[PDB]
Amino acid sequence: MKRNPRVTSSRRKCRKAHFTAPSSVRRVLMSAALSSELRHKYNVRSIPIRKDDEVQVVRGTYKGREGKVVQVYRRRWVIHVERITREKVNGSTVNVGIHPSKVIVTKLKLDKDRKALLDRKARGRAADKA
Amino acid sequence: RQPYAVSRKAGHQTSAESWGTGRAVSRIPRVGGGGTHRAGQGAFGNMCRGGRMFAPTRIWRKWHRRVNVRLRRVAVASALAATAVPAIVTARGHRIESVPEFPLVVSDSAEGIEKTAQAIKVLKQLGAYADAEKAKDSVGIRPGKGKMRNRRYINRKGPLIVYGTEGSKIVKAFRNLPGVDVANVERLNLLDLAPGGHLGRFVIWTESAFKKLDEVYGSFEASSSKKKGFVLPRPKMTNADLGRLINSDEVQ
RNA sequence: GCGCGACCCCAGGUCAGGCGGGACUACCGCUGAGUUUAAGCAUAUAAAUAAGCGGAGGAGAAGAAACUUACAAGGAUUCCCCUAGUAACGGCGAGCGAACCGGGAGCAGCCCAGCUUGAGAAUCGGGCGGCUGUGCCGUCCGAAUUGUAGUCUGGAGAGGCGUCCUCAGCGACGGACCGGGCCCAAGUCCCCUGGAAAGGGGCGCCUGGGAGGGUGAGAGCCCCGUCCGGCCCGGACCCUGUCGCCCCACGAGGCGCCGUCAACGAGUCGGGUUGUUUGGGAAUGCAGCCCAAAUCGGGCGGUAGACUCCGUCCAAGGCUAAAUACAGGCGAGAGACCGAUAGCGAACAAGUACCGCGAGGGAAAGAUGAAAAGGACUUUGAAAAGAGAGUCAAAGAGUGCUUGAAAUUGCCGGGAGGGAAGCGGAUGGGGGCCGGCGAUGCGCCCCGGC
RNA sequence: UUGAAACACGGACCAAGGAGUCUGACAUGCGUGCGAGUCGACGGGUUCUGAAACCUGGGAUGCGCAAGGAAGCUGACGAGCGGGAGGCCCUCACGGGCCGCACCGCUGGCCGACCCUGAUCUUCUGUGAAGGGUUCGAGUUGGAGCACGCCUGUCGGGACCC
RNA sequence: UCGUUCGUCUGACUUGGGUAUAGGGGCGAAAGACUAAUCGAACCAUCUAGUAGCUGGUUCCCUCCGAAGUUUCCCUCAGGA
RNA sequence: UAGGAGGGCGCGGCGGCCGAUGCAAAACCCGGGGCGCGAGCCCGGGCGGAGCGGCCGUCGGUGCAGAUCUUGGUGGUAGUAGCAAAUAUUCAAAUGAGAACUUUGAAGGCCGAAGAGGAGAAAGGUUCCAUGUGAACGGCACUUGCACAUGGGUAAGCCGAUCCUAAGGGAAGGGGUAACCCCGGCAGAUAGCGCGAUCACGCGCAUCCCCGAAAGGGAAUCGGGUUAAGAUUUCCCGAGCC
RNA sequence: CUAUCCAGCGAAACCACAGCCAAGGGAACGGGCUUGGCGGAAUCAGCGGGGAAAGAAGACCCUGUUGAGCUUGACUCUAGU
RNA sequence: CGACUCUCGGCAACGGAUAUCUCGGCUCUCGCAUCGAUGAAGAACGUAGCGAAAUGCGAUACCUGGUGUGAAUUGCAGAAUCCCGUGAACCAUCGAGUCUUUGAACGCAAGUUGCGCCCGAGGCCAUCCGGCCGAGGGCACGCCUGCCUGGGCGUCACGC
Ligand SMILES: [Mg+2]
Ligand SMILES: [Mg+2]
Ligand SMILES: [Mg+2]
Ligand SMILES: [Mg+2]
Ligand SMILES: [Mg+2]
Ligand SMILES: [Mg+2]
Ligand SMILES: [Mg+2]
Ligand SMILES: [Mg+2]
Ligand SMILES: [Mg+2]
Ligand SMILES: [Mg+2]
Ligand SMILES: [Mg+2]
Ligand SMILES: [Mg+2]
Ligand SMILES: [Mg+2]
Ligand SMILES: [Mg+2]
Ligand SMILES: [Mg+2]
Ligand SMILES: [Mg+2]
Ligand SMILES: [Mg+2]
Ligand SMILES: [Mg+2]
Ligand SMILES: [Mg+2]
Ligand SMILES: [Mg+2]
Ligand SMILES: [Mg+2]
Ligand SMILES: [Mg+2]
Ligand SMILES: [Mg+2]
Ligand SMILES: [Mg+2]
Ligand SMILES: [Mg+2]
Ligand SMILES: [Mg+2]
Ligand SMILES: [Mg+2]
Ligand SMILES: [Mg+2]
Ligand SMILES: [Mg+2]
Ligand SMILES: [Mg+2]
Ligand SMILES: [Mg+2]
Ligand SMILES: [Mg+2]
Ligand SMILES: [Mg+2]
Ligand SMILES: [Mg+2]
Ligand SMILES: [Mg+2]
Ligand SMILES: [Mg+2]
Ligand SMILES: [Mg+2]
Ligand SMILES: [Mg+2]
Ligand SMILES: [Mg+2]
Ligand SMILES: [Mg+2]
Ligand SMILES: [Mg+2]
Ligand SMILES: [Mg+2]
Ligand SMILES: [Mg+2]
Ligand SMILES: [Mg+2]
Ligand SMILES: [Mg+2]
Ligand SMILES: [Mg+2]
Ligand SMILES: [Mg+2]
Ligand SMILES: [Mg+2]
Ligand SMILES: [Mg+2]
Ligand SMILES: [Mg+2]
Ligand SMILES: [Mg+2]
Ligand SMILES: [Mg+2]
Ligand SMILES: [Mg+2]
Ligand SMILES: [Mg+2]
Ligand SMILES: [Mg+2]
Ligand SMILES: [Mg+2]
Ligand SMILES: [Mg+2]
Ligand SMILES: [Mg+2]
Ligand SMILES: [Mg+2]
Ligand SMILES: [Mg+2]
Ligand SMILES: [Mg+2]
Ligand SMILES: [Mg+2]
Ligand SMILES: [Mg+2]
Ligand SMILES: [Mg+2]
Ligand SMILES: [Mg+2]
């Protein structure tokens, strides 16, 4: 159990550090689990999400609906994805917010810096697997 | 306990002063000035809105109480005695219908275990794992204000493993299991030997700790114990079987 | 018609530089009350406090005996325990009240002034210049002989003799300490309810990781994190660890002896008187005024006095970490605390809106929903809105919107009333509501198979 | 308040907040541990969730085991009686005898203060064989105390609240 | 404050601005008047939760026991031992 | 009764034990059913939509009808008291959903020039002007407004401040003060030096600083136009002045 | 001109519950208690007998081991001279 | 029957108690020592495409620059090569910069954007090869070390 006497175990301070986090930290919290197959490929379990990833929501009321991410909206702790969208009363079309922890990154937008991140998060997992 | 108190200055950061009599209102102090709703409102009372509390809590309460060293030792003796009686453990709330023997003692091969799966496997030979599961599935959120004062989850109490070889790795193998506690044999703790004030924590002694429990607590002899100035208390009766006393030939 | 040097003092927007104000927790100095207690009150107490006025730091202050003790004596300062609610002080009333000894925490001792280069200021600053640059060096000015440097500090020391013993610097490479970043185990498998599965069942997995937090309901395995540690970047380093070159003296120290010197702080101590303060009592410190030293001497030894002896220390100059304090600031962590009339005055654009000329006074105010999906459109209305409709799991959760109490008001249905009503005890008449409100089962028998 | 329905005072009603608490000393009572001891409370070492826990010293720290005097000083040389719970012995038992804790009452003894007394011995001013006392002691002839907790009470602190 | 009726109106006259005097102090043709609706001692904060032998209040049930206004002393008589 | 004690009921935590909960927790409502003498408890139904209870030990900011208790709300009083000074309004028409209150016209009146007129000082600070208006406000009303919203507007060599002194105020050196702070003539190489000359020097230095008046003193401006709102003399036109 | 009525707007003091009397008793002057008299819906506008009506913890008096202003031949001190 | 009054239930209101929460408080503990004439604390005024407050910043003004991360901000619009890169971001962090008027506040004062004096980059014409307009920047107080110019028969030596 916690042994490091520098990390708080207080609900108040943890909720501060969560809901008051800057954008550079909200990126890391906006992480989603990879698909099983892409996990098998890249030897990592979770990744923070990007502008143009293909996600497949698994637990919202929109289960099974694959869609490209269109707007990771870090303020409201949501992401907007293609066509997973609803209709106002008047008839305007609005994308709904799905928390990043409820999507799985089926296909990944390989930036070179993302490749580097996948390398680091891969060898970190595997060097302690072995 | 940690101390808790209200501020020295609560209620007394208003500069109010009683209106005195003759204003058709009570004689309680009232705030001066104007331009607010606060003007004219009562203050400095424990009955006011925004005043003190009666006899405010202060940091110099008696938080820590003292018990005689010999009385702590006597109590640890009685708790150790109560660990040995199967009816006391079963009354106290541990699922023991499959443990082999009391007091339950396992070999020193337990001392070398490292992993939590290994600790579970060790509990499987014993009968403890019914109790350990009882704690694990009885973990649940603490009702009341404790679920926001950083006391979220409560659980039951599981077996207390006692080891003798200090620096062993069962302390780290058993730590993650909910409800299960690990103790060293030199420094037994009453909070573990009798949680809640009730007798009979289900204790699992390792074979190293068990054979030096005599060297630690000793017997009815001066200086036999590793503790100074301590001998085991003697009961006010040698034999507590009222059945045998009353039904003995002498009495009858 | 002077040119000189010194002194003392000018003016310089001269060159180079230090000062002032802010914060209040803690710390140092001065100043300095009363409400209160004494059942009045005046000394006392509150209190050597609050307020006032100043000064610093990371701590401040104190500190290396002009000490205590009366012992077999000990040995700087500071703090804790004990001494001790004791000795003492007090209209001996209320009350007030330390210290030595002892045990602990930490312990480090130092440097000046004076007699002492006189073949000879050996010292320091500044301008300029160089380099290796928190300094060193050269040159030129100045300070200074009314004394800079060196030696000395009473535990000593200066001299003289002595075999003898002891002294130097520069590199590298770490460790150590501090900050920062990155990374790191395991189900989102099947069925069911559900708007949502984080719920229930079933099949499994991690655990040196079941602290905590988020995510659409009780999530170890969805996510951030937690355990083990791993990696890399930067700092101060001035602490030590080993390696390498550099080899330690005729100078200084230590040790042994000698006997010759042996230098030590002045309107200061100390004394009288006054005032304050103290536990300090023929006077505990301090302060004003007056008197005013001593060198075979001076201050102490808790009763003033003189004599004899004894114990003890050496003031009137200076520096010094550690243990200790910490409602301020910066950064952290925890709680048997408070849960929006509580807790800071302030959960919120709170020291804000508002009041006062001004000193100053000073509140109230949190919650839709999972997601605004914040109500399209049709119709009555001048319009606000209404009625349909629509979004939603629900909007009767509809922008002060989680639940939604009583006081109090309305409408519907019932009941009753000759200047009160309400309440207690009787039943009676109405209602309204109760099937655990109220049972049908036991024994004897004969089949007909179980 | 002697006396309230009173022409005595407060109360229009509702909701929420609202008044003997904390700390120090002491004391009795009760519980626990030990018991001529008892306290580890300031420190130290440990402490793999921990401000916890456990260990440690004490050969004299607090209180207690010695008191009387202002002080110098001195400092308990060993208790009997009456009534008694209870046990025991005898008797067929009624009754009788023995031992009799606690407690109550009575009388003493010893220590000390004050007074009184004085063989010997001795460092000549000390001791103290014998004998004492209408005196005084918060004494002894019973070792029971220490620590913790709780209530109650007194007092200090805002001190039940305004 | 309003209405009518009144006092004085070349004077020790009426008045604006600037300025001086600030709390046991000011200023007063004197009423203890005025000193910001406050004056026989302003107002603001603090010591301060001043003290009170005096007034008011003092929060759940049942069971059991259950009184005193009397002595003595006190600057003591509304109080306390 | 004052008072004392015992046994219990209840609220909120902590250490334990037994549980409930999206097939509905907490809370609250009920002419629902019961248990206890009673504090109180148990069950039923409704709303509610996420937590909660029981037992043992123990702890506490623990139980309200009063305190002219504190904060917040609500009543009866009650559609009651009341809306009354300053003479006074009336008629058509227009706008408008709507007119006793708006606007135009007409008529009657008042202020009567020490005014209910035209402008300023202090004070206010955008109230000024235009366009629009759901609410609130204008103690009746409103199409309207000094309200709400969006825009716009204040032009100076000559008008003032600026300059000089008054009562007075602050101050450099100094004197006092424990220090903040208090004294300005106390005479000090006095704050400042000045003027002629720089192609430099000579002469003088006397009651020796600053601040203080939009009513005192005072370099200079008049006429005519012009804007939705500026100006008389601020802009334009002409003519002047310092 | 109000008061009255009407449209519109629309408070507050106060309030244990409330409001008919006689006599008696009683905290010695009752709306409530006892014995009687009586007593018939609901409203309108006045009025000032009562509600020992409202306003105010009585200022008159007393108690306080509470103050304050002032005085002086009170007690203890003090600047100044 | 009905109105009025009292009253019971159902439903509706007013009101915001209770129930569940909580980016806040309080309390305890620990680590460190860091303001200012090189202009602090405080104050004022400005500053965003659409902003009033609060948060931020200072005429480079809700930011500039380096480093780190690596694809956003977000209420609307927009430009965006801003995408396997000299690189988005109301991001983090900090060394390179800016830092208006004030305030110990410092030229003199201050209900004054009041009144001065000096240097001076740069330009004009030449009343000369000097003068006019300047971008900027100085000018306070006591004080120390030094330097300059000085004063007094205070002490003198030498001199006319
Ligand atoms: Mg009244
Ligand atoms: Mg409070
Ligand atoms: Mg007194
Ligand atoms: Mg008194
Ligand atoms: Mg008095
Ligand atoms: Mg102070
Ligand atoms: Mg120091
Ligand atoms: Mg003692
Ligand atoms: Mg004292
Ligand atoms: Mg993970
Ligand atoms: Mg599941
Ligand atoms: Mg969770
Ligand atoms: Mg003094
Ligand atoms: Mg004295
Ligand atoms: Mg020092
Ligand atoms: Mg609490
Ligand atoms: Mg509050
Ligand atoms: Mg809801
Ligand atoms: Mg909800
Ligand atoms: Mg609601
Ligand atoms: Mg109701
Ligand atoms: Mg009638
Ligand atoms: Mg009845
Ligand atoms: Mg009946
Ligand atoms: Mg009476
Ligand atoms: Mg009467
Ligand atoms: Mg009364
Ligand atoms: Mg009343
Ligand atoms: Mg002892
Ligand atoms: Mg006897
Ligand atoms: Mg008390
Ligand atoms: Mg008049
Ligand atoms: Mg005048
Ligand atoms: Mg005047
Ligand atoms: Mg007045
Ligand atoms: Mg009080
Ligand atoms: Mg008071
Ligand atoms: Mg009385
Ligand atoms: Mg008494
Ligand atoms: Mg309370
Ligand atoms: Mg209550
Ligand atoms: Mg109440
Ligand atoms: Mg009551
Ligand atoms: Mg009327
Ligand atoms: Mg009128
Ligand atoms: Mg005229
Ligand atoms: Mg006019
Ligand atoms: Mg207008
Ligand atoms: Mg109106
Ligand atoms: Mg002037
Ligand atoms: Mg003028
Ligand atoms: Mg003029
Ligand atoms: Mg012109
Ligand atoms: Mg009407
Ligand atoms: Mg009558
Ligand atoms: Mg009456
Ligand atoms: Mg009758
Ligand atoms: Mg009327
Ligand atoms: Mg009437
Ligand atoms: Mg009348
Ligand atoms: Mg009347
Ligand atoms: Mg009275
Ligand atoms: Mg008296
Ligand atoms: Mg007096
Ligand atoms: Mg006299």
PDB file of N, CA and C (backbone and C1' of nucleotides) in Angstrom, chain C residues 227-245:
ATOM      1  P     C C 227       4.198   3.875  -4.190  1.00  0.00           P
ATOM      2  O5'   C C 227       4.226   2.289  -4.225  1.00  0.00           O
ATOM      3  C5'   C C 227       3.888   1.528  -3.078  1.00  0.00           C
ATOM      4  C4'   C C 227       4.382   0.117  -3.216  1.00  0.00           C
ATOM      5  C3'   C C 227       5.819  -0.011  -3.686  1.00  0.00           C
ATOM      6  O3'   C C 227       6.757   0.084  -2.636  1.00  0.00           O
ATOM      7  C1'   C C 227       4.444  -1.392  -5.000  1.00  0.00           C
ATOM      8  P     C C 228       8.212   0.679  -2.925  1.00  0.00           P
ATOM      9  O5'   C C 228       8.880  -0.390  -3.892  1.00  0.00           O
ATOM     10  C5'   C C 228       9.280  -1.660  -3.408  1.00  0.00           C
ATOM     11  C4'   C C 228       9.689  -2.569  -4.536  1.00  0.00           C
ATOM     12  C3'   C C 228      10.887  -2.119  -5.346  1.00  0.00           C
ATOM     13  O3'   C C 228      12.104  -2.492  -4.735  1.00  0.00           O
ATOM     14  C1'   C C 228       9.150  -2.807  -6.795  1.00  0.00           C
ATOM     15  P     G C 229      12.965  -1.417  -3.921  1.00  0.00           P
ATOM     16  O5'   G C 229      14.197  -1.108  -4.877  1.00  0.00           O
ATOM     17  C5'   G C 229      14.163  -0.013  -5.778  1.00  0.00           C
ATOM     18  C4'   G C 229      13.959  -0.475  -7.196  1.00  0.00           C
ATOM     19  C3'   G C 229      14.703   0.310  -8.262  1.00  0.00           C
ATOM     20  O3'   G C 229      16.050  -0.101  -8.403  1.00  0.00           O
ATOM     21  C1'   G C 229      12.453   0.003  -8.922  1.00  0.00           C
ATOM     22  P     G C 230      17.144   0.924  -8.973  1.00  0.00           P
ATOM     23  O5'   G C 230      16.804   1.021 -10.523  1.00  0.00           O
ATOM     24  C5'   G C 230      16.966  -0.104 -11.371  1.00  0.00           C
ATOM     25  C4'   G C 230      16.536   0.213 -12.778  1.00  0.00           C
ATOM     26  C3'   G C 230      17.126   1.480 -13.369  1.00  0.00           C
ATOM     27  O3'   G C 230      18.424   1.278 -13.890  1.00  0.00           O
ATOM     28  C1'   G C 230      14.801   1.434 -13.759  1.00  0.00           C
ATOM     29  P     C C 231      19.552   2.402 -13.704  1.00  0.00           P
ATOM     30  O5'   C C 231      19.322   3.380 -14.940  1.00  0.00           O
ATOM     31  C5'   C C 231      19.038   2.864 -16.230  1.00  0.00           C
ATOM     32  C4'   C C 231      18.302   3.872 -17.071  1.00  0.00           C
ATOM     33  C3'   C C 231      18.894   5.267 -17.096  1.00  0.00           C
ATOM     34  O3'   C C 231      19.991   5.370 -17.985  1.00  0.00           O
ATOM     35  C1'   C C 231      16.544   5.390 -16.829  1.00  0.00           C
ATOM     36  P     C C 232      21.353   6.080 -17.517  1.00  0.00           P
ATOM     37  O5'   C C 232      21.141   7.605 -17.924  1.00  0.00           O
ATOM     38  C5'   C C 232      20.735   7.948 -19.239  1.00  0.00           C
ATOM     39  C4'   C C 232      19.918   9.217 -19.272  1.00  0.00           C
ATOM     40  C3'   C C 232      20.544  10.456 -18.658  1.00  0.00           C
ATOM     41  O3'   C C 232      21.513  11.067 -19.488  1.00  0.00           O
ATOM     42  C1'   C C 232      18.271  10.309 -18.023  1.00  0.00           C
ATOM     43  P     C C 233      22.594  12.062 -18.844  1.00  0.00           P
ATOM     44  O5'   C C 233      21.774  13.396 -18.554  1.00  0.00           O
ATOM     45  C5'   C C 233      21.159  14.122 -19.609  1.00  0.00           C
ATOM     46  C4'   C C 233      20.446  15.349 -19.098  1.00  0.00           C
ATOM     47  C3'   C C 233      21.194  16.170 -18.066  1.00  0.00           C
ATOM     48  O3'   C C 233      22.205  16.991 -18.617  1.00  0.00           O
ATOM     49  C1'   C C 233      18.974  15.877 -17.349  1.00  0.00           C
ATOM     50  P     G C 234      23.505  17.331 -17.739  1.00  0.00           P
ATOM     51  O5'   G C 234      22.992  18.455 -16.739  1.00  0.00           O
ATOM     52  C5'   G C 234      22.293  19.586 -17.230  1.00  0.00           C
ATOM     53  C4'   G C 234      21.642  20.356 -16.114  1.00  0.00           C
ATOM     54  C3'   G C 234      22.557  20.760 -14.975  1.00  0.00           C
ATOM     55  O3'   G C 234      23.332  21.904 -15.281  1.00  0.00           O
ATOM     56  C1'   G C 234      20.571  19.848 -14.095  1.00  0.00           C
ATOM     57  P     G C 235      24.458  22.411 -14.258  1.00  0.00           P
ATOM     58  O5'   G C 235      23.621  23.196 -13.155  1.00  0.00           O
ATOM     59  C5'   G C 235      24.256  23.730 -12.009  1.00  0.00           C
ATOM     60  C4'   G C 235      23.368  23.656 -10.795  1.00  0.00           C
ATOM     61  C3'   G C 235      24.108  23.578  -9.473  1.00  0.00           C
ATOM     62  O3'   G C 235      24.530  24.842  -9.007  1.00  0.00           O
ATOM     63  C1'   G C 235      22.510  21.869  -9.542  1.00  0.00           C
ATOM     64  P     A C 236      26.045  25.309  -9.256  1.00  0.00           P
ATOM     65  O5'   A C 236      26.588  25.586  -7.786  1.00  0.00           O
ATOM     66  C5'   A C 236      25.790  26.285  -6.846  1.00  0.00           C
ATOM     67  C4'   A C 236      25.301  25.375  -5.750  1.00  0.00           C
ATOM     68  C3'   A C 236      26.349  24.877  -4.776  1.00  0.00           C
ATOM     69  O3'   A C 236      26.716  25.830  -3.800  1.00  0.00           O
ATOM     70  C1'   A C 236      25.033  23.064  -5.465  1.00  0.00           C
ATOM     71  P     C C 237      28.224  26.377  -3.774  1.00  0.00           P
ATOM     72  O5'   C C 237      29.110  25.054  -3.738  1.00  0.00           O
ATOM     73  C5'   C C 237      29.162  24.235  -2.578  1.00  0.00           C
ATOM     74  C4'   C C 237      28.705  22.828  -2.869  1.00  0.00           C
ATOM     75  C3'   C C 237      29.244  21.736  -1.958  1.00  0.00           C
ATOM     76  O3'   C C 237      28.443  21.645  -0.786  1.00  0.00           O
ATOM     77  C1'   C C 237      29.286  21.045  -4.260  1.00  0.00           C
ATOM     78  P     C C 238      28.652  20.495   0.314  1.00  0.00           P
ATOM     79  O5'   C C 238      30.223  20.446   0.520  1.00  0.00           O
ATOM     80  C5'   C C 238      30.872  21.332   1.420  1.00  0.00           C
ATOM     81  C4'   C C 238      32.364  21.287   1.235  1.00  0.00           C
ATOM     82  C3'   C C 238      33.151  22.300   2.055  1.00  0.00           C
ATOM     83  O3'   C C 238      34.402  21.727   2.426  1.00  0.00           O
ATOM     84  C1'   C C 238      33.545  22.667  -0.247  1.00  0.00           C
ATOM     85  P     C C 239      34.545  20.925   3.811  1.00  0.00           P
ATOM     86  O5'   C C 239      33.474  19.751   3.700  1.00  0.00           O
ATOM     87  C5'   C C 239      32.712  19.346   4.828  1.00  0.00           C
ATOM     88  C4'   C C 239      32.329  17.891   4.739  1.00  0.00           C
ATOM     89  C3'   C C 239      33.406  16.957   4.217  1.00  0.00           C
ATOM     90  O3'   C C 239      34.304  16.577   5.241  1.00  0.00           O
ATOM     91  C1'   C C 239      31.313  16.461   3.198  1.00  0.00           C
ATOM     92  P     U C 240      35.821  16.188   4.897  1.00  0.00           P
ATOM     93  O5'   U C 240      35.740  14.633   4.572  1.00  0.00           O
ATOM     94  C5'   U C 240      34.958  13.766   5.386  1.00  0.00           C
ATOM     95  C4'   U C 240      34.601  12.491   4.667  1.00  0.00           C
ATOM     96  C3'   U C 240      35.797  11.662   4.227  1.00  0.00           C
ATOM     97  O3'   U C 240      35.477  10.278   4.314  1.00  0.00           O
ATOM     98  C1'   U C 240      34.518  12.259   2.333  1.00  0.00           C
ATOM     99  P     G C 241      36.664   9.206   4.360  1.00  0.00           P
ATOM    100  O5'   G C 241      36.685   8.613   2.887  1.00  0.00           O
ATOM    101  C5'   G C 241      35.959   7.438   2.572  1.00  0.00           C
ATOM    102  C4'   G C 241      36.360   6.910   1.224  1.00  0.00           C
ATOM    103  C3'   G C 241      37.818   7.108   0.842  1.00  0.00           C
ATOM    104  O3'   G C 241      38.675   6.146   1.431  1.00  0.00           O
ATOM    105  C1'   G C 241      36.424   7.681  -0.981  1.00  0.00           C
ATOM    106  P     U C 242      40.256   6.411   1.515  1.00  0.00           P
ATOM    107  O5'   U C 242      40.795   5.929   0.097  1.00  0.00           O
ATOM    108  C5'   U C 242      40.451   4.651  -0.417  1.00  0.00           C
ATOM    109  C4'   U C 242      40.578   4.612  -1.918  1.00  0.00           C
ATOM    110  C3'   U C 242      41.927   5.029  -2.469  1.00  0.00           C
ATOM    111  O3'   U C 242      42.886   3.994  -2.388  1.00  0.00           O
ATOM    112  C1'   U C 242      40.207   6.081  -3.709  1.00  0.00           C
ATOM    113  P     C C 243      44.428   4.294  -2.698  1.00  0.00           P
ATOM    114  O5'   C C 243      44.579   3.863  -4.222  1.00  0.00           O
ATOM    115  C5'   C C 243      45.480   4.538  -5.080  1.00  0.00           C
ATOM    116  C4'   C C 243      44.846   4.870  -6.405  1.00  0.00           C
ATOM    117  C3'   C C 243      45.639   5.828  -7.275  1.00  0.00           C
ATOM    118  O3'   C C 243      46.706   5.212  -7.967  1.00  0.00           O
ATOM    119  C1'   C C 243      43.440   6.602  -7.137  1.00  0.00           C
ATOM    120  P     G C 244      48.210   5.486  -7.478  1.00  0.00           P
ATOM    121  O5'   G C 244      48.615   6.818  -8.243  1.00  0.00           O
ATOM    122  C5'   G C 244      48.610   6.854  -9.658  1.00  0.00           C
ATOM    123  C4'   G C 244      48.834   8.248 -10.181  1.00  0.00           C
ATOM    124  C3'   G C 244      49.918   9.058  -9.497  1.00  0.00           C
ATOM    125  O3'   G C 244      51.227   8.697  -9.895  1.00  0.00           O
ATOM    126  C1'   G C 244      48.008  10.403  -9.820  1.00  0.00           C
ATOM    127  P     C C 245      52.450   8.891  -8.872  1.00  0.00           P
ATOM    128  O5'   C C 245      53.002  10.345  -9.212  1.00  0.00           O
ATOM    129  C5'   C C 245      53.324  10.705 -10.546  1.00  0.00           C
ATOM    130  C4'   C C 245      53.229  12.195 -10.746  1.00  0.00           C
ATOM    131  C3'   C C 245      54.063  13.039  -9.794  1.00  0.00           C
ATOM    132  O3'   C C 245      55.415  13.149 -10.203  1.00  0.00           O
ATOM    133  C1'   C C 245      51.864  13.898  -9.884  1.00  0.00           C
TER     134        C C 245
END
